[PDB]
Amino acid sequence: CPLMVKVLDAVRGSPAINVAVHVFRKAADDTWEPFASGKTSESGELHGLTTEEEFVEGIYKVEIDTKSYWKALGISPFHEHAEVVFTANDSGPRRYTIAALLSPYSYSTTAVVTN
Amino acid sequence: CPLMVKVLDAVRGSPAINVAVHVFRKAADDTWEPFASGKTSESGELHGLTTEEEFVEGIYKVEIDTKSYWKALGISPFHEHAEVVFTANDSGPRRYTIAALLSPYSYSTTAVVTN
Amino acid sequence: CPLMVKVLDAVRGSPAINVAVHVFRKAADDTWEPFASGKTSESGELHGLTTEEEFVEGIYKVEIDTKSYWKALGISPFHEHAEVVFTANDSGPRRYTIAALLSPYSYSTTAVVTN
Amino acid sequence: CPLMVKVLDAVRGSPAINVAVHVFRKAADDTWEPFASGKTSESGELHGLTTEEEFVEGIYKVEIDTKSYWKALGISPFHEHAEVVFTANDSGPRRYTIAALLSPYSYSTTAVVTN
Ligand SMILES: CCc1oc2ccccc2c1C(=O)c1cc(Br)c(O)c(Br)c1
Ligand SMILES: CCc1oc2ccccc2c1C(=O)c1cc(Br)c(O)c(Br)c1
């Protein structure tokens, strides 16, 4: 709801299905603590990672496990994963879509922030 | 010198070699007239398309023959070609690099304008 | 329904709203004939361009009017527009999403093809 | 020589100049140890990060300080930084270029691996 992840495959022209996504939040002791995780659906989307109540101000890292995605397709990719690090909700609650477009040696990521 | 084209391959993580590139300039009657062409080098670059004397202000189209590139690699592509259409202006910087990053179902293009 | 266009703004992190989109289909006389047009919604999406009945096999060009989008925002962009040229429905009907991500000197486009 | 970083600006259509770049190598205990760093040149490039002798197989992280880059331009950014994580392998080609294309709410990264 407040945080959604969408992943596309630039080789097949398709949603990237069953991609593992791990979200971390930076803690007071400046360490990365686990916040939420899931896998993308048949539409390439991952909903329900968190709630408005739990998604407080902070620095978040969305790690998209691109290497295991490509390896499951029989491809040896370049990157270990795609990491998206950003401050969230510093100006009040927002809704964030973190999108990634994947190729074996390249990826792009963008944020769509609304409300 | 005033206009360079660089093409990269996001699947192989390499320069895109031997890619045909056609440049057109818009004529008075809204027709695309051929201006310059070539094939990318082993570095993925196409130099020597034009000269300062010939590269006047105008609307230019750079067509990158991506479909034939992917077919030569045995890879099934989406686009017929990649087309980059832009106005060249003399008050902005006067070296133009048109770069493209290719995947089978996606491409990105950027302009690097210097000096 | 069979053809959707989605446009995002990489500067604001938002849908690109009210972007003009023109679709052409290559005719027998190898000319570009108008096929459909519209403008993106508040979600950055353009639905209803065509129907299954009208969206026959062919070579299509989706022209996204990026220059007028940026100029309306007070920015002088590099490109005249973004052009996406592809063969559609050659293996039977498909559903096509043509997506574009816009910056003043760069754009990316990808195709999501389903069914 | 074996590792180069290049950073481009998609808003201005220019090299991204004076961008801080930090490279880390994964240690035995899963900690990121500092490996090399620098700032991009006027061409947007960072050369001389390492030598062939020092750049052994391993997992590397390239952190590009995009937030400070956008702040210096008076532009409001989304990401804290851009992070590129990859394994270097000796049997693949042995020159690595890590390239990044930056917008305020989006970035793309690709690897160009040659020789
Ligand atoms: C080796 C990578 C690279 O080499 C260059 C040489 C001259 C000018 C630009 C570049 C360049 C980048 O443009 C680049 C990075 C990404 Br990510 C792209 O999606 C596109 Br398109 C271009
Ligand atoms: C909200 C982001 C989003 O919305 C979609 C709706 C339908 C199909 C694809 C997408 C999509 C993408 O992941 C996307 C991501 C990047 Br990065 C791009 O450069 C481009 Br272009 C598209």
Author numbering:
A (entry chain B), B (entry chain A), C (entry chain B), D (entry chain A): 10 to 124
According to the publication:
Transthyretin (TTR) is a protein of 127 amino acids that self-assembles as a 55 kDa homotetramer that is secreted into the bloodstream by the liver and into the cerebrospinal fluid (CSF) by the choroid plexus. TTR transports holo-retinol-binding protein in the blood, forming a macromolecular complex. The protein acts as a backup carrier of thyroxine (T4) in serum (crystal structure in Figure 1), where the principal transporters are thyroid-binding globulin (TBG) and albumin, while being the primary carrier of T4 in CSF. Transthyretin (TTR) amyloidoses are a group of systemic degenerative diseases involving multiple organ systems and are caused by TTR aggregation, such as familial amyloid polyneuropathy (FAP), familial amyloid cardiomyopathy (FAC), senile systemic amyloidosis and leptomeningeal amyloidosis.
The two dimers that form TTR are related by a crystallographic 2-fold axis that runs along a central channel. BBM molecules bind deeply within the thyroxine binding pocket, with bromine atoms at the inner side of the cavity. The two bromine atoms are anchored in HBP3’, comprising the side chains of Ser117’, Leu110’, Thr119’ and Ala108’, and in HBP2, comprising residues Leu17, Ala108, Ala109 and Leu110, respectively. Nevertheless, superposition of the two crystals structures reveals that BMM binds slightly deeper than TBBPA. BBM shows similar binding affinities to TTR in buffer (i.e., similar ΔG values) compared to IDIF, tolcapone and tafamidis. These ITC results confirm that BBM is a potent binder of TTR.
